[PDB]
Amino acid sequence: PLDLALKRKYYEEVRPELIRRFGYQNVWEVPRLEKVVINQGLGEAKEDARILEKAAQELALITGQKPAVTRAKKSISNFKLRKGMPIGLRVTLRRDRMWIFLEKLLNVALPRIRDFRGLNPNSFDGRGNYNLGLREQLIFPEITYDMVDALRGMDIAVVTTAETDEEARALLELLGFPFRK
């Protein structure tokens, strides 16, 4: 389904707002979202491979995309890990399904958070990408109450043709991100 608000938001709204703000010279040099990665630090489900399926299928309806995993390379002896075996969920979303995830983020995910305050502005990686943490993934639409067996956490990532955080800062505000000033 190639169409949505954020599909056009970036275009008939953000496209020229940037050309004014920074003034490019070519249609491509303009900062674009193009890669949303979603991650999970599930060292917890080290034991239960069952709870592995839940964070995965939940991820399915929230990310609107099939989920994937990744076991470690040199695993922490101390915290119950050793070699190739463990677990760390990961699911890169691109094209349009990326958008349809984002629309749920700044218009549903954020507005109903336990005392959400604003996306920490320091979260820019010096270059043009963003990373931010969430505790409850039940703030997502499809997730019902009597269904979650535990508060599994995770953290999202969004890659941008941005070359500096200023340029990224502007490009996320313009698409619609509730920054903590």
């Binding site: 349809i100 549903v108 507005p111 639409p141 499809e142």
Partner: peptide
């Protein structure tokens, strides 16, 4: 499919996703 967000506070966004019956509340409209 066309996912309607009848978020409780006064609004109904026809977005895309799963299940057109998306009951919500306290979104961006409030």
């Amino acid at each position: 499919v066309p996912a309607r967000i009848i978020c409780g506070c006064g609004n109904v966004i026809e977005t895309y996703s799963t299940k057109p019956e998306i009951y919500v509340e306290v979104c961006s409209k409030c």
